[PDB]
Amino acid sequence: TRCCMGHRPLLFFITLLFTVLGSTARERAKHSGDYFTLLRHLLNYAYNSNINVPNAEVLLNNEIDWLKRIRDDVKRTGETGIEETILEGHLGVTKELLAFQTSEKKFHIGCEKGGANLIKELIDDFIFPASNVYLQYMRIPVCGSPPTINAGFELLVALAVGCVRNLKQIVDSLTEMYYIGTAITTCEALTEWEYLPPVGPRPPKGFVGLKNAGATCYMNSVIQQLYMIPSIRNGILAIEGTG
Amino acid sequence: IIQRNGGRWYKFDDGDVTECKMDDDEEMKNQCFGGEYMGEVFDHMMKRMSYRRQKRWWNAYILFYERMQDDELIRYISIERSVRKQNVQFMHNRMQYSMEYFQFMKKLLTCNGVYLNPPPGQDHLLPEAEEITMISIQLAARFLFTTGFHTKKVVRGSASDWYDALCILLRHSKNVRFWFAHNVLFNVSNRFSEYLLECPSAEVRGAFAKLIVFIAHFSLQDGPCPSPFNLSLSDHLLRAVLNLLRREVSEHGRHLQQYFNLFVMYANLGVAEKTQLLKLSVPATFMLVSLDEGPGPPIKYQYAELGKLYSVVSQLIRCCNVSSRMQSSINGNPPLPNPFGDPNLSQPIMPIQQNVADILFVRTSYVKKIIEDCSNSEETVKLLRFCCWENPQFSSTVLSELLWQVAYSYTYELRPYLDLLLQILLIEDSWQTHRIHNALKGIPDDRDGLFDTIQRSKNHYQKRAYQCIKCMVALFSNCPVAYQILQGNGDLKRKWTWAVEWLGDEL
Amino acid sequence: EDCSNSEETVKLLRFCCWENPQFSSTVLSELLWQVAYSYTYELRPYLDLLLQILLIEDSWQTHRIHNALKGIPDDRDGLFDTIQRSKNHYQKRAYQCIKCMVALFSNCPVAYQILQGNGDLKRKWTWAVEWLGDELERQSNETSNGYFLERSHSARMTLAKACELCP
């Protein structure tokens, strides 16, 4: 940024790193975290300082291919075929590299009839796959971790910056998922002024408890003891036709 | 309970499931083995120690032992639906309130902001940024007023930031500003009530109030908005905010500072707003409130903070013309010009209007209220020094009230009153001599004077007389005209003597 | 002044102070004047007559109760004001004014739907009762001669009965 005072050294790196891919950059898969965040920093400096990267689009279209296959990874297994930190960056690099496109691009990706419908993908495959089940009921996300859940967002936002046609779909889709239930003519409320989900997240290694009504402690403890028994748990749930 | 794992104990209390450290045998003694133990008791703000025999009223009750999925138990001798549906809902509702979802909303709305400025040679947005604003304001309205402002501070995150995000969209465009008002404010008939008064969060009320000020301000140059039940949008917004005085303001004391900054900050804008506020009889309806004579029931909360109801009336009145209400004392002379009106303003907006004059000048309930309650503030001194200026009857009214409180009020609160008394005596107009006269002698046959309250309080409540002397010492040392009244009137001169020794002897 | 503690005076005042704002203004004006300017022991009959004027269930009862506690308008002639005069000296006048109010709220619902529901009175009511509690901590009845307070049982139970009206 400072010592170069010229638009030359960064290009050597840009290519240098983009050169490394599902090769050694994949090999570490744990130490590549500091690799990836730098990659944003150099690309970010390119845009704001109006420094033109030569190989912009070609690299980018591979990331859609990169993200398309891993969308099928969970779709085929249920568990992502890559480590979490790689997904952190490949989404993050797509953002900065998405800046080097016009509104004719960035819409050929998102909303495009014949393009790779990437705004559709991140909405109902990466971040909100559960709500699609819920909306279909009113008729496993690729991003699991909060850092990865975030990473899907600043990619979504970058798809809308400077493109009203992409912003409309993103805003439209968010309405039918969360704010179409009531906010068609009037905007209702939760009526509780400091609200969170009262159920909790159920930590993974934790277990499901039983709520107490105030004096149901004697019956809650009994059920908890009975269920943990492997024979009672397996045998009772196998008792079919009780309905 | 032990969990059957391939490679432990856990804590199972009600709906809570956590890990436990009872694998060590000492914890087994502490929780389940029970028994009596020599307890340690700390009390008396951690200064007294005593040892008490305590019974472990937590102890094991029923124990289960396991011997070291059987097909025989499934054999005869003689639904995943409810699980899915509640699991589906929790996944859906977990994301709506996830912290990184809120940081997503900020980015989605605050991005494209550099595209939202109008072209430098134009005072409106071109079609594209007009539609980007139109779409984003739809979502910002949907998100914030359904689940945005109700979420807790840890996730919602300093709702002033949401107000900043809303400012970017709402300004620079007229139809968007019209859409917002007519779709999330003038559609519910409880929007202004629930967010300005009912919301038990200072930030949200403040952010919403700052939002109404913003919309009302920048809609001044907009055309006549349709009436939501030739009136501009700011005309409607203030009318709806003023409709809360009828019932809700009375019902919802303890939440009022942020309801009056809606008017304090709407006046700190300029002259175009203060003119609007004055034409709405905002001062006239605000003096009636805090007198419980307003358009609705009295405020039901004891320690209601009306300190900003006065600062609106103070600023709004100090823009009017009291020219027709000054007397020159020295007969023949014309009334002196008012040097205590509004700075940052050339000429008075309008003559002081009737109903305001009948509450401030003709009557004296308001002057009691602000002096009694809001005396420590500095928007009251400005109102008093602006009205006491060459107004003989009013300057007596303020002295009548101030001499009452300096005498018949609680000994620990005189300093707010006495310090206010100075800037009433230190008004160098044609009536100044009288004010020092009717503060040291007292208005006869009702209110005492600074000397009289000293005599009344030398024996008991000596702190009252001491604080009165501090006022007098400060007044004489910093007012020349006061010194030529002390030096030149033997009676006041002679009484001032007895005061000084008494202070010394008590010391 | 003269025929205050008799039975045919209360009957005449109660008969004319019914749906008559003009007359009830004078009766309150005079009573509030006599509550202020009278001996602390010749004060009991005037307050006892003041209650029975307030407990007249005509349409002006709220108005009448208002212009007895706050005061005849924009003047310092009111029960909460006469307490403020006689709070440092003549303390027996404040207590009897408080004991008047205690007997008012405890016996008139409409007088307790004003105290609990107006705030400013409820603020001043709190100011009065806390002073009484602070005065009985720093034996003949207060309705007799004396100067400071005469900390008797009459006071200590009207203070405990006052601090159940202010929550």
PDB file of all heavy atoms in Angstrom, chain A residues 220-236:
ATOM      1  N   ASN A 220     -40.570 -34.038  36.078  1.00  0.00           N
ATOM      2  CA  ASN A 220     -39.530 -33.782  35.087  1.00  0.00           C
ATOM      3  C   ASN A 220     -38.316 -34.668  35.330  1.00  0.00           C
ATOM      4  O   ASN A 220     -37.759 -35.251  34.393  1.00  0.00           O
ATOM      5  CB  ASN A 220     -39.133 -32.305  35.109  1.00  0.00           C
ATOM      6  CG  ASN A 220     -40.267 -31.390  34.695  1.00  0.00           C
ATOM      7  OD1 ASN A 220     -41.316 -31.847  34.244  1.00  0.00           O
ATOM      8  ND2 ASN A 220     -40.060 -30.087  34.846  1.00  0.00           N
ATOM      9  N   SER A 221     -37.891 -34.781  36.591  1.00  0.00           N
ATOM     10  CA  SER A 221     -36.711 -35.577  36.908  1.00  0.00           C
ATOM     11  C   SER A 221     -36.928 -37.048  36.579  1.00  0.00           C
ATOM     12  O   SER A 221     -36.004 -37.733  36.125  1.00  0.00           O
ATOM     13  CB  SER A 221     -36.347 -35.405  38.382  1.00  0.00           C
ATOM     14  OG  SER A 221     -37.379 -35.893  39.221  1.00  0.00           O
ATOM     15  N   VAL A 222     -38.144 -37.551  36.805  1.00  0.00           N
ATOM     16  CA  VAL A 222     -38.432 -38.958  36.534  1.00  0.00           C
ATOM     17  C   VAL A 222     -38.291 -39.261  35.048  1.00  0.00           C
ATOM     18  O   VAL A 222     -37.676 -40.261  34.659  1.00  0.00           O
ATOM     19  CB  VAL A 222     -39.834 -39.324  37.057  1.00  0.00           C
ATOM     20  CG1 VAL A 222     -40.231 -40.714  36.589  1.00  0.00           C
ATOM     21  CG2 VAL A 222     -39.870 -39.245  38.572  1.00  0.00           C
ATOM     22  N   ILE A 223     -38.853 -38.402  34.194  1.00  0.00           N
ATOM     23  CA  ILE A 223     -38.806 -38.647  32.755  1.00  0.00           C
ATOM     24  C   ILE A 223     -37.371 -38.596  32.248  1.00  0.00           C
ATOM     25  O   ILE A 223     -36.955 -39.430  31.434  1.00  0.00           O
ATOM     26  CB  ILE A 223     -39.705 -37.643  32.012  1.00  0.00           C
ATOM     27  CG1 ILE A 223     -41.148 -37.755  32.501  1.00  0.00           C
ATOM     28  CG2 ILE A 223     -39.638 -37.880  30.514  1.00  0.00           C
ATOM     29  CD1 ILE A 223     -41.766 -39.113  32.263  1.00  0.00           C
ATOM     30  N   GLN A 224     -36.594 -37.617  32.718  1.00  0.00           N
ATOM     31  CA  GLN A 224     -35.199 -37.510  32.303  1.00  0.00           C
ATOM     32  C   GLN A 224     -34.428 -38.782  32.627  1.00  0.00           C
ATOM     33  O   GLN A 224     -33.640 -39.267  31.806  1.00  0.00           O
ATOM     34  CB  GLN A 224     -34.540 -36.303  32.974  1.00  0.00           C
ATOM     35  CG  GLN A 224     -35.092 -34.959  32.534  1.00  0.00           C
ATOM     36  CD  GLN A 224     -34.887 -34.704  31.056  1.00  0.00           C
ATOM     37  OE1 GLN A 224     -35.842 -34.671  30.281  1.00  0.00           O
ATOM     38  NE2 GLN A 224     -33.633 -34.527  30.656  1.00  0.00           N
ATOM     39  N   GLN A 225     -34.639 -39.334  33.822  1.00  0.00           N
ATOM     40  CA  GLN A 225     -33.962 -40.571  34.195  1.00  0.00           C
ATOM     41  C   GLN A 225     -34.390 -41.733  33.307  1.00  0.00           C
ATOM     42  O   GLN A 225     -33.560 -42.565  32.922  1.00  0.00           O
ATOM     43  CB  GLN A 225     -34.233 -40.894  35.662  1.00  0.00           C
ATOM     44  CG  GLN A 225     -33.260 -41.896  36.238  1.00  0.00           C
ATOM     45  CD  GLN A 225     -31.835 -41.395  36.188  1.00  0.00           C
ATOM     46  OE1 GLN A 225     -30.999 -41.944  35.469  1.00  0.00           O
ATOM     47  NE2 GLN A 225     -31.547 -40.349  36.953  1.00  0.00           N
ATOM     48  N   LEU A 226     -35.679 -41.807  32.970  1.00  0.00           N
ATOM     49  CA  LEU A 226     -36.185 -42.966  32.244  1.00  0.00           C
ATOM     50  C   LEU A 226     -35.699 -42.985  30.801  1.00  0.00           C
ATOM     51  O   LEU A 226     -35.404 -44.055  30.256  1.00  0.00           O
ATOM     52  CB  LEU A 226     -37.711 -42.989  32.293  1.00  0.00           C
ATOM     53  CG  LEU A 226     -38.326 -43.354  33.644  1.00  0.00           C
ATOM     54  CD1 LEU A 226     -39.814 -43.052  33.648  1.00  0.00           C
ATOM     55  CD2 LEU A 226     -38.073 -44.817  33.967  1.00  0.00           C
ATOM     56  N   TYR A 227     -35.614 -41.816  30.162  1.00  0.00           N
ATOM     57  CA  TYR A 227     -35.312 -41.787  28.735  1.00  0.00           C
ATOM     58  C   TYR A 227     -33.881 -42.225  28.448  1.00  0.00           C
ATOM     59  O   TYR A 227     -33.626 -42.902  27.446  1.00  0.00           O
ATOM     60  CB  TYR A 227     -35.562 -40.392  28.166  1.00  0.00           C
ATOM     61  CG  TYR A 227     -35.023 -40.228  26.763  1.00  0.00           C
ATOM     62  CD1 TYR A 227     -35.763 -40.639  25.665  1.00  0.00           C
ATOM     63  CD2 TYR A 227     -33.774 -39.663  26.539  1.00  0.00           C
ATOM     64  CE1 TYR A 227     -35.272 -40.499  24.386  1.00  0.00           C
ATOM     65  CE2 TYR A 227     -33.277 -39.521  25.263  1.00  0.00           C
ATOM     66  CZ  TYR A 227     -34.032 -39.935  24.192  1.00  0.00           C
ATOM     67  OH  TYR A 227     -33.536 -39.792  22.919  1.00  0.00           O
ATOM     68  N   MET A 228     -32.932 -41.841  29.306  1.00  0.00           N
ATOM     69  CA  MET A 228     -31.526 -42.117  29.034  1.00  0.00           C
ATOM     70  C   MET A 228     -31.237 -43.608  28.921  1.00  0.00           C
ATOM     71  O   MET A 228     -30.244 -43.989  28.291  1.00  0.00           O
ATOM     72  CB  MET A 228     -30.650 -41.497  30.123  1.00  0.00           C
ATOM     73  CG  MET A 228     -29.157 -41.624  29.869  1.00  0.00           C
ATOM     74  SD  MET A 228     -28.629 -40.738  28.392  1.00  0.00           S
ATOM     75  CE  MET A 228     -28.761 -39.045  28.961  1.00  0.00           C
ATOM     76  N   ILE A 229     -32.083 -44.456  29.497  1.00  0.00           N
ATOM     77  CA  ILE A 229     -31.904 -45.904  29.434  1.00  0.00           C
ATOM     78  C   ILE A 229     -31.987 -46.343  27.977  1.00  0.00           C
ATOM     79  O   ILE A 229     -33.003 -46.091  27.312  1.00  0.00           O
ATOM     80  CB  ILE A 229     -32.953 -46.630  30.288  1.00  0.00           C
ATOM     81  CG1 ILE A 229     -32.899 -46.138  31.735  1.00  0.00           C
ATOM     82  CG2 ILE A 229     -32.738 -48.128  30.227  1.00  0.00           C
ATOM     83  CD1 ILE A 229     -31.573 -46.375  32.411  1.00  0.00           C
ATOM     84  N   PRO A 230     -30.948 -46.989  27.439  1.00  0.00           N
ATOM     85  CA  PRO A 230     -31.000 -47.400  26.023  1.00  0.00           C
ATOM     86  C   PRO A 230     -32.150 -48.337  25.700  1.00  0.00           C
ATOM     87  O   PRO A 230     -32.745 -48.228  24.620  1.00  0.00           O
ATOM     88  CB  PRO A 230     -29.634 -48.070  25.809  1.00  0.00           C
ATOM     89  CG  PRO A 230     -28.751 -47.475  26.863  1.00  0.00           C
ATOM     90  CD  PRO A 230     -29.641 -47.277  28.053  1.00  0.00           C
ATOM     91  N   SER A 231     -32.486 -49.258  26.606  1.00  0.00           N
ATOM     92  CA  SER A 231     -33.572 -50.195  26.333  1.00  0.00           C
ATOM     93  C   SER A 231     -34.922 -49.491  26.346  1.00  0.00           C
ATOM     94  O   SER A 231     -35.754 -49.705  25.457  1.00  0.00           O
ATOM     95  CB  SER A 231     -33.551 -51.338  27.349  1.00  0.00           C
ATOM     96  OG  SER A 231     -33.366 -50.850  28.665  1.00  0.00           O
ATOM     97  N   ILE A 232     -35.159 -48.650  27.354  1.00  0.00           N
ATOM     98  CA  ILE A 232     -36.409 -47.899  27.413  1.00  0.00           C
ATOM     99  C   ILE A 232     -36.528 -46.970  26.212  1.00  0.00           C
ATOM    100  O   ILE A 232     -37.586 -46.886  25.579  1.00  0.00           O
ATOM    101  CB  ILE A 232     -36.508 -47.125  28.739  1.00  0.00           C
ATOM    102  CG1 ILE A 232     -36.538 -48.092  29.924  1.00  0.00           C
ATOM    103  CG2 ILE A 232     -37.743 -46.240  28.749  1.00  0.00           C
ATOM    104  CD1 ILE A 232     -36.394 -47.412  31.268  1.00  0.00           C
ATOM    105  N   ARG A 233     -35.445 -46.266  25.875  1.00  0.00           N
ATOM    106  CA  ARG A 233     -35.484 -45.342  24.747  1.00  0.00           C
ATOM    107  C   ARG A 233     -35.763 -46.071  23.439  1.00  0.00           C
ATOM    108  O   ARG A 233     -36.640 -45.664  22.668  1.00  0.00           O
ATOM    109  CB  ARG A 233     -34.167 -44.572  24.659  1.00  0.00           C
ATOM    110  CG  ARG A 233     -34.024 -43.729  23.406  1.00  0.00           C
ATOM    111  CD  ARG A 233     -32.731 -42.934  23.426  1.00  0.00           C
ATOM    112  NE  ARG A 233     -31.566 -43.775  23.672  1.00  0.00           N
ATOM    113  CZ  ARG A 233     -30.701 -43.582  24.657  1.00  0.00           C
ATOM    114  NH1 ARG A 233     -30.851 -42.596  25.527  1.00  0.00           N
ATOM    115  NH2 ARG A 233     -29.658 -44.401  24.775  1.00  0.00           N
ATOM    116  N   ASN A 234     -35.035 -47.156  23.175  1.00  0.00           N
ATOM    117  CA  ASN A 234     -35.222 -47.877  21.921  1.00  0.00           C
ATOM    118  C   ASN A 234     -36.528 -48.661  21.920  1.00  0.00           C
ATOM    119  O   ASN A 234     -37.255 -48.666  20.919  1.00  0.00           O
ATOM    120  CB  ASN A 234     -34.035 -48.807  21.671  1.00  0.00           C
ATOM    121  CG  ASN A 234     -32.724 -48.056  21.549  1.00  0.00           C
ATOM    122  OD1 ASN A 234     -32.678 -46.944  21.025  1.00  0.00           O
ATOM    123  ND2 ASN A 234     -31.647 -48.663  22.036  1.00  0.00           N
ATOM    124  N   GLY A 235     -36.839 -49.335  23.028  1.00  0.00           N
ATOM    125  CA  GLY A 235     -38.023 -50.176  23.063  1.00  0.00           C
ATOM    126  C   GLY A 235     -39.323 -49.398  22.973  1.00  0.00           C
ATOM    127  O   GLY A 235     -40.228 -49.772  22.222  1.00  0.00           O
ATOM    128  N   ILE A 236     -39.434 -48.304  23.729  1.00  0.00           N
ATOM    129  CA  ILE A 236     -40.702 -47.581  23.799  1.00  0.00           C
ATOM    130  C   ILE A 236     -41.001 -46.897  22.471  1.00  0.00           C
ATOM    131  O   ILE A 236     -42.129 -46.948  21.967  1.00  0.00           O
ATOM    132  CB  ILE A 236     -40.687 -46.576  24.965  1.00  0.00           C
ATOM    133  CG1 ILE A 236     -40.739 -47.321  26.298  1.00  0.00           C
ATOM    134  CG2 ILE A 236     -41.860 -45.624  24.862  1.00  0.00           C
ATOM    135  CD1 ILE A 236     -41.993 -48.144  26.483  1.00  0.00           C
TER     136      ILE A 236
END
